[PDB]
């Protein structure tokens, strides 16, 4: 059983880092 | 949500910013009417001196 990867799936960190980088569009505007 | 608030604030600032600009843009225009009018009165004062120096007419 590879249940350890179940925890490793929590990051997945860049999924929100890219979102924050895009949200920097408010500062750009 | 943070984004939201920040964006709103920026827009709000711009609102206030424009609300400020127009305000002073008005005040100078009004001031432009005042100063010219003031100048008119200045002229009158000058002329009021002239008639005040014409002894026979004064």
UniProtKB/Swiss-Prot annotation, chain A:
It is found in: Vacuole membrane. Present with 2280 molecules/cell in log phase SD medium. This is V-type proton ATPase subunit G. Belongs to the V-ATPase G subunit family. GO terms for cellular component: fungal-type vacuole membrane; Golgi membrane; proton-transporting V-type ATPase complex; vacuolar proton-transporting V-type ATPase complex; vacuolar proton-transporting V-type ATPase, V1 domain. Coiled coil: none annotated. Subunit of the V1 complex of vacuolar(H+)-ATPase (V-ATPase), a multisubunit enzyme composed of a peripheral complex (V1) that hydrolyzes ATP and a membrane integral complex (V0) that translocates protons. V-ATPase is responsible for acidifying and maintaining the pH of intracellular compartments. One of its GO terms (molecular function) is ATP hydrolysis activity. It comes from Saccharomyces cerevisiae (strain ATCC 204508 / S288c) (Baker's yeast). The chain holds residues 29 to 57 of 114 of the full protein. V-ATPase is a heteromultimeric enzyme composed of a peripheral catalytic V1 complex (components A to H) attached to an integral membrane V0 proton pore complex (components: a, c, c', c'', d, e, f and VOA1). Keywords: Acetylation, Hydrogen ion transport, Ion transport, Membrane, Transport, Vacuole. The keyword Transport applies. GO terms for biological process: endosomal lumen acidification; Golgi lumen acidification; proton transmembrane transport; vacuolar acidification.
Swiss-Prot record, chain B:
It is found in: Vacuole membrane. Keywords: Acetylation, Coiled coil, Hydrogen ion transport, Ion transport, Membrane, Transport, Vacuole. One of its GO terms (molecular function) is proton-transporting ATPase activity, rotational mechanism. GO terms for biological process: endosomal lumen acidification; Golgi lumen acidification; proton transmembrane transport; vacuolar acidification. Its main location: membrane. The keyword Transferase does not apply. It comes from the Eukaryota. GO terms for cellular component: fungal-type vacuole membrane; Golgi membrane; membrane raft; proton-transporting V-type ATPase complex; vacuolar proton-transporting V-type ATPase complex; vacuolar proton-transporting V-type ATPase, V1 domain. Changing residue 19 to A: Reduces ATPase activity by 88%. Prevents assembly of V1 subunits at the membrane. The keyword Transport applies. Subunit of the V1 complex of vacuolar(H+)-ATPase (V-ATPase), a multisubunit enzyme composed of a peripheral complex (V1) that hydrolyzes ATP and a membrane integral complex (V0) that translocates protons. V-ATPase is responsible for acidifying and maintaining the pH of intracellular compartments. Present with 16134 molecules/cell in log phase SD medium. Homodimer. V-ATPase is a heteromultimeric enzyme composed of a peripheral catalytic V1 complex (components A to H) attached to an integral membrane V0 proton pore complex (components: a, c, c', c'', d, e, f and VOA1). Interacts with VMA5; the interaction is direct. Interacts with VMA10; the interaction is direct. Interacts with RAV1 and RAV2 components of the RAVE complex, which are essential for the stability and assembly of V-ATPase. Belongs to the V-ATPase E subunit family. This is V-type proton ATPase subunit E.
């Amino acid at each position: 059983q590879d249940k350890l990867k179940q925890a490793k799936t929590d990051a997945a960190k860049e999924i929100d880092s890219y979102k924050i980088q895009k949200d920097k569009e408010l500062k750009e505007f | 949500g943070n984004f939201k608030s920040k964006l709103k604030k920026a827009m709000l600032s711009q609102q206030i910013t424009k609300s400020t600009i127009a305000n002073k843009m008005r005040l100078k225009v009004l001031s432009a009417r005042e100063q010219s009018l003031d100048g008119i009165f200045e002229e009158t004062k000058e002329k009021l001196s002239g008639i005040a120096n014409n002894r026979d007419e004064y």
